[PDB]
A = this chain, B = another copy of it.
């Protein structure tokens, strides 16, 4: 439930490799890549204190709330821990609404898949 974050970097062969970590008690997320990088990966979980799930950007703080917002809203709806990896170029806010609506449609049609 309690999230901690870490990052580190290393020169391996002739390239800078960048690592991000998210630690929960029973789960670990390891991300390997380059720096700089996009910060489009989030996790949210239902707090038992508030009705609003706490959403964290796993790849470093960002002011873009697309992934954190989606994760939070889906965690609210499903009552489980939700990771979102949002890999779309098009960050028009209306496009994101279309995407979110499509996800909700799938959840209505196939609740057992979520």
Residues of B within 8 A of A112 (CB): 4
How many chain copies? Answer: 2
CB distance from A42 to the nearest CB of B (A): 10
A90 in complex: contacting residue of B15, B23, B41, CB < 8 Å: B15
**A82 and B27 contact, CB distance less than 8 A:** yes
Residues of B within 8 A of A19 (CB): 102-103, 106
Interface size bucket, A side?
35 or more
Query: Measuring CB to CB, which residues of chain A are less than 8 angstroms from any residue of chain B?
Result: 4, 6, 8, 10, 12-13, 15, 17, 19, 21, 23, 26-34, 37, 41, 70-71, 74, 78, 80-88, 90, 95, 98-99, 102-103, 106, 110, 112-114
